[PDB]
Amino acid sequence: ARLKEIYRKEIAPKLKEELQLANVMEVPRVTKITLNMGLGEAVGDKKIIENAVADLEKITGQKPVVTYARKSIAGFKIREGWPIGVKVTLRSDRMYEFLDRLLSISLPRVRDFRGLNAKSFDGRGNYSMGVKEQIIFPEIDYDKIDALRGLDITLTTTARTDDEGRALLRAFKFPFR
Amino acid sequence: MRELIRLVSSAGTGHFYTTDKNKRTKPEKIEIKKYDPVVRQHVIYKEAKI
Amino acid sequence: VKKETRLRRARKARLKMRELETVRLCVYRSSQHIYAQVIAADGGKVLASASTLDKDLREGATGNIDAAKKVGQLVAERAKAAGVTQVAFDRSGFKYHGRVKALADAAREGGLEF
Amino acid sequence: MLQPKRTKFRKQMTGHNRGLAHRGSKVSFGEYALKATSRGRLTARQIESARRALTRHVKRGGKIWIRVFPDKPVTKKPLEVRMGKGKGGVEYWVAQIQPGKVLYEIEGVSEELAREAFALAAAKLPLATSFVKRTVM
Amino acid sequence: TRNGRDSESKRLGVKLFGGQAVKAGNILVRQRGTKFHAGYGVGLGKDHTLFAKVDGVVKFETKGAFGRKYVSIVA
RNA sequence: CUAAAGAGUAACGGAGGAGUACGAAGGUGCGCUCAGACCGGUCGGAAAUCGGUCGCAGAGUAUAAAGGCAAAAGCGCGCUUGACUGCGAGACAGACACGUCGAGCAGGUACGAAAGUAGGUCUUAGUGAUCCGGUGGUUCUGUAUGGAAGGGCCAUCGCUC
RNA sequence: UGCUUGACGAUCAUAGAGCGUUGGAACCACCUGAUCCCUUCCCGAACUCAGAAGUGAAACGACGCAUCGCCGAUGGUAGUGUGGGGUCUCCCCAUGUGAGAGUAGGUCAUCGUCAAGCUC
Ligand SMILES: [Mg+2]
Ligand SMILES: [Mg+2]
Ligand SMILES: [Mg+2]
Ligand SMILES: [Mg+2]
Ligand SMILES: [Mg+2]
Ligand SMILES: [Mg+2]
Ligand SMILES: [Mg+2]
Ligand SMILES: [Mg+2]
Ligand SMILES: [Mg+2]
Ligand SMILES: [Mg+2]
Ligand SMILES: [Mg+2]
């Protein structure tokens, strides 16, 4: 990919001599980015569920799979087994191609870019971020948009402690605070 | 309730199996292979009203 | 680990070889080699074995389908000599496909009934 | 009035009372205790009366524990009702007492005061009791 | 609202104890679940009936990684 | 539960359920492992979907409880009809009538590469004798004879009897 | 001669867990790539295939340690068969039996078949 060889040849030798690691493969590495969309309002209409496939596939190039409720909640109008979301997983060079597109091309075109939270870590080196709205991704067409919807990004890395996670994330030139 | 049905052999024999069936959820007729002891072959049986 | 999920994936067939008192052609598959044991019904004794660690198979390719054919044909020769003809093929949780299938197919042509 | 405040079953079999109370026979918590030397039942009304007699006498200072809980429901047939036609309906709650069970405990008071307050409580109770000090093992 | 019902006793339990001679087909245990498990020469019925598949003597054994009580037929 | 550690065991004793369901929720091969908690994450909140750690069955098992459940007996997918026909050694249970389990043999299948597995469903409720009448088969009988009627035999239907 | 590694068993915690140290010659694992066989209700994550550039980081194996877990006496106690007795809702005596809990303590397993390497 455009970013895969960058990590393989320059970021990895940068981190090993930066984190003071005695092994080569101990360096934190992004394993996958998965894109979830919590599909609300599907309690009454299903026209949005295959609309979600349309936008989610185009910004990733992979066909998403529709998720279903693990339980039945009275507070919301959903029951076990209805489609209430979509998700995509990227691990190949497609994983790296999306990362550069989101980092350099997509992220700048947002309403109010105050950076990204640096404390947004689970505590085990995995970074999670959420996109407030759509149309940040250039792939879609604004005219050909049924509704305006968000989605979230999860950087699942092999880092042990979240300080390694931010170190690798900053090595990607991630805009933080 | 589950009303009784008759699975009648496709062969020339008058052999029939009997079973029940939910006639609202699945109103389509049952077609299934069962052993016909008259011709000693596995044969398709078709649902008929008992 | 994915080794634990494989052994428990192989438990049912192995427990079925016992309670049947059948001689088992156990198979192990690695990234570098592929093995084949002919284990007694009790499971605690091996009657014949063949791997890519044999003198005639250490050199050259060992972790491909071709090496599986040579090992499977070899274990058929040793099993017949040991006095074993009717076995049951244990895939040991490995999918019956590719190398594992090639080893078994060689034993089928080698004179092992399974 | 002590009650389990909810139960799995409303009614219980009468059962028996045969032990020697090898558990609940030590003075934990406090330093002086009222120990049952005989065997019987303690209703919730009796336990409360003994509690009130005991607490009123150690006025202004002390800590008191109730180590007897009436968790056993006891039924009664009404008057003018024949045998049969069901068990009968819970009337009160009792605690089964074996000899040796510690019923009440106190601390923060002198031994002379503790004996005085335990005599007051023991007169409300239908069992033979005794005064015991906390022991090392 | 009231009571007074019960079902018939099922006559479950061990029919042949340890060391008893068995013929093939003899019912060894009647049970609800598998309180006892089928060892060597012992079959399992639809209702988890343990029955003899071979002739021999009953052997009860507890063994395995799960602590299952087994019924086996030995010579 | 009472029920007294084999079985059984009464009370107008203490508590709950049943009078069904499913051609898939059956068979098989393959594959998987729940509940809950915490942390991070757009709407999203205690709780929706996503990722990670713990968790190790506290979930699930059509349904009441009890006993079971890793070869999961729980969950998914592909192909299917073994929810087969004749039987059946041997048992359990038992006043009788009924009832339960079942290796194995034959015929014919399904799934699997194969060993194998499958005669319904994790198990234990979901039921009603005979008579009479109806329907489908039948090499049986057929009141002088040939038929037929009617009868018998096998399958099956009609009782909140 | 013994050791190491791997596969399959015996046994099923005195065997487990946790923590720490160590192993890459071989084995194994991670690993490289995905056209080929095959796979994802998306994704070479898993499954599969062709390999050997890299590493023992993860996992696994070995070693150590009583922190947890597990095991656990002796003595006593409870219960209890039979015979007898009392103050008989419950106990006692003779005789036979005898826990559970707890205490002292113990445990970082033991064994077998086969294959490869090494040692002697
Ligand atoms: Mg009994
Ligand atoms: Mg008894
Ligand atoms: Mg949340
Ligand atoms: Mg929360
Ligand atoms: Mg089920
Ligand atoms: Mg005539
Ligand atoms: Mg007729
Ligand atoms: Mg790989
Ligand atoms: Mg290490
Ligand atoms: Mg102990
Ligand atoms: Mg003891």
Tab-separated table of C-alpha atoms in Angstrom, chain A residues 2-151:
chain	number	residue	atom	x	y	z
A	2	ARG	CA	0.966	3.673	0.087
A	3	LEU	CA	1.490	3.583	3.864
A	4	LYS	CA	2.350	-0.093	4.421
A	5	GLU	CA	5.908	0.213	3.122
A	6	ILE	CA	6.347	3.438	5.109
A	7	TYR	CA	5.602	1.541	8.314
A	8	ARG	CA	7.643	-1.474	7.226
A	9	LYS	CA	10.790	0.504	6.356
A	10	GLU	CA	10.815	3.746	8.366
A	11	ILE	CA	8.214	3.757	11.158
A	12	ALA	CA	9.239	0.351	12.522
A	13	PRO	CA	12.974	1.206	12.814
A	14	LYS	CA	11.897	4.522	14.339
A	15	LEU	CA	9.776	2.944	17.081
A	16	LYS	CA	12.140	0.123	18.088
A	17	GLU	CA	14.919	2.600	18.901
A	18	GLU	CA	12.348	4.979	20.436
A	19	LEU	CA	10.425	2.685	22.816
A	20	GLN	CA	13.672	0.868	23.763
A	21	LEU	CA	12.479	-2.569	22.677
A	22	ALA	CA	14.871	-5.525	22.571
A	23	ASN	CA	12.920	-7.431	19.907
A	24	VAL	CA	11.942	-6.513	16.365
A	25	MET	CA	8.343	-7.754	16.395
A	26	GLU	CA	7.659	-6.251	19.834
A	27	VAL	CA	7.000	-2.947	18.024
A	28	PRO	CA	3.335	-1.875	18.145
A	29	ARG	CA	1.540	-2.413	14.852
A	30	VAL	CA	-1.992	-1.705	13.699
A	31	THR	CA	-3.691	-5.059	13.185
A	32	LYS	CA	-7.041	-3.843	11.860
A	33	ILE	CA	-9.376	-0.886	11.471
A	34	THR	CA	-13.044	-1.843	11.621
A	35	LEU	CA	-15.831	0.588	10.752
A	36	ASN	CA	-19.098	0.250	12.661
A	37	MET	CA	-22.338	2.153	12.095
A	38	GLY	CA	-24.969	2.038	14.804
A	39	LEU	CA	-28.113	1.976	12.683
A	40	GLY	CA	-30.836	3.562	14.772
A	41	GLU	CA	-34.359	4.356	13.588
A	42	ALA	CA	-34.379	0.910	11.927
A	43	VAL	CA	-37.104	-0.097	14.389
A	44	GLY	CA	-39.718	0.955	11.836
A	45	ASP	CA	-38.069	1.181	8.404
A	46	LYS	CA	-35.481	-1.050	6.726
A	47	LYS	CA	-34.780	1.215	3.744
A	48	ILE	CA	-31.803	2.634	5.630
A	49	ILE	CA	-30.133	-0.736	6.244
A	50	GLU	CA	-29.096	-1.323	2.631
A	51	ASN	CA	-28.448	2.401	2.303
A	52	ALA	CA	-25.849	1.893	5.034
A	53	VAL	CA	-24.221	-0.772	2.849
A	54	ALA	CA	-24.027	1.759	0.014
A	55	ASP	CA	-22.006	4.440	1.812
A	56	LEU	CA	-19.983	2.099	4.033
A	57	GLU	CA	-18.831	-0.052	1.106
A	58	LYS	CA	-17.764	2.885	-1.066
A	59	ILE	CA	-15.471	4.463	1.554
A	60	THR	CA	-13.777	1.095	2.162
A	61	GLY	CA	-14.209	-0.991	-0.979
A	62	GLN	CA	-15.353	-4.005	1.069
A	63	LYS	CA	-18.898	-5.320	1.321
A	64	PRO	CA	-20.145	-4.836	4.905
A	65	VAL	CA	-22.128	-7.383	6.890
A	66	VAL	CA	-25.260	-6.334	8.740
A	67	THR	CA	-25.112	-6.926	12.490
A	68	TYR	CA	-28.013	-7.923	14.733
A	69	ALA	CA	-29.102	-7.310	18.304
A	70	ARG	CA	-27.617	-9.726	20.829
A	71	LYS	CA	-30.604	-9.201	23.148
A	72	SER	CA	-34.097	-7.692	23.256
A	73	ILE	CA	-34.337	-4.327	25.026
A	74	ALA	CA	-37.620	-2.745	26.090
A	75	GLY	CA	-36.184	0.772	26.337
A	76	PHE	CA	-35.461	0.807	22.608
A	77	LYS	CA	-37.895	-0.536	20.020
A	78	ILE	CA	-35.677	-3.467	19.029
A	79	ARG	CA	-35.735	-7.203	19.635
A	80	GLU	CA	-33.248	-10.011	19.256
A	81	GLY	CA	-32.327	-10.597	15.626
A	82	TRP	CA	-33.267	-7.386	13.863
A	83	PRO	CA	-30.600	-5.687	11.729
A	84	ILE	CA	-29.458	-2.621	13.673
A	85	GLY	CA	-25.986	-1.962	12.300
A	86	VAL	CA	-23.287	-2.676	9.747
A	87	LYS	CA	-19.563	-3.296	10.043
A	88	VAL	CA	-16.440	-3.760	7.913
A	89	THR	CA	-13.019	-5.174	8.829
A	90	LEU	CA	-9.753	-4.263	7.074
A	91	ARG	CA	-6.452	-6.089	7.595
A	92	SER	CA	-4.703	-6.269	4.203
A	93	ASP	CA	-3.095	-3.444	2.242
A	94	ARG	CA	-6.697	-2.224	2.064
A	95	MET	CA	-6.250	-1.627	5.800
A	96	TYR	CA	-3.349	0.748	5.138
A	97	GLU	CA	-4.901	2.449	2.099
A	98	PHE	CA	-7.947	3.459	4.139
A	99	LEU	CA	-5.718	4.698	6.965
A	100	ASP	CA	-3.899	7.204	4.753
A	101	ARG	CA	-7.135	8.300	3.062
A	102	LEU	CA	-8.750	8.955	6.437
A	103	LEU	CA	-5.635	10.541	7.950
A	104	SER	CA	-4.563	12.939	5.202
A	105	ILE	CA	-7.503	13.358	2.815
A	106	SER	CA	-10.627	12.867	4.943
A	107	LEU	CA	-9.789	14.208	8.412
A	108	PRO	CA	-8.907	17.793	7.305
A	109	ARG	CA	-12.350	18.326	5.723
A	110	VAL	CA	-14.392	18.518	8.923
A	111	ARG	CA	-16.476	21.345	10.365
A	112	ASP	CA	-14.334	22.150	13.423
A	113	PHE	CA	-10.986	20.347	13.589
A	114	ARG	CA	-9.671	20.861	17.116
A	115	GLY	CA	-7.551	17.713	16.810
A	116	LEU	CA	-8.141	14.201	18.083
A	117	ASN	CA	-8.358	13.055	21.687
A	118	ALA	CA	-5.072	11.541	22.833
A	119	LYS	CA	-6.645	9.905	25.902
A	120	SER	CA	-9.127	7.994	23.698
A	121	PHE	CA	-7.512	4.646	24.473
A	122	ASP	CA	-9.028	1.512	25.973
A	123	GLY	CA	-5.925	1.080	28.134
A	124	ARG	CA	-4.418	-1.721	26.025
A	125	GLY	CA	-3.035	0.162	23.023
A	126	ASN	CA	-6.173	0.228	20.850
A	127	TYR	CA	-7.393	3.598	19.588
A	128	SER	CA	-11.078	4.360	19.046
A	129	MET	CA	-12.447	7.426	17.270
A	130	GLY	CA	-15.857	8.468	16.010
A	131	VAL	CA	-16.851	10.590	13.030
A	132	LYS	CA	-19.683	12.974	13.876
A	133	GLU	CA	-21.195	13.182	10.394
A	134	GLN	CA	-20.865	11.856	6.839
A	135	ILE	CA	-19.518	13.503	3.607
A	136	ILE	CA	-16.057	13.817	5.140
A	137	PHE	CA	-15.142	10.887	2.895
A	138	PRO	CA	-14.745	12.096	-0.719
A	139	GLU	CA	-15.967	8.799	-2.201
A	140	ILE	CA	-19.679	9.531	-1.683
A	141	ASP	CA	-21.774	12.061	-3.607
A	142	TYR	CA	-23.478	14.764	-1.550
A	143	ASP	CA	-26.425	14.911	-3.955
A	144	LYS	CA	-26.752	11.105	-3.875
A	145	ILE	CA	-27.104	10.907	-0.092
A	146	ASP	CA	-30.372	9.664	1.394
A	147	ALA	CA	-29.566	10.784	4.943
A	148	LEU	CA	-26.653	12.177	6.927
A	149	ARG	CA	-25.133	9.526	9.206
A	150	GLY	CA	-21.973	9.026	11.243
A	151	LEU	CA	-19.679	6.087	11.961
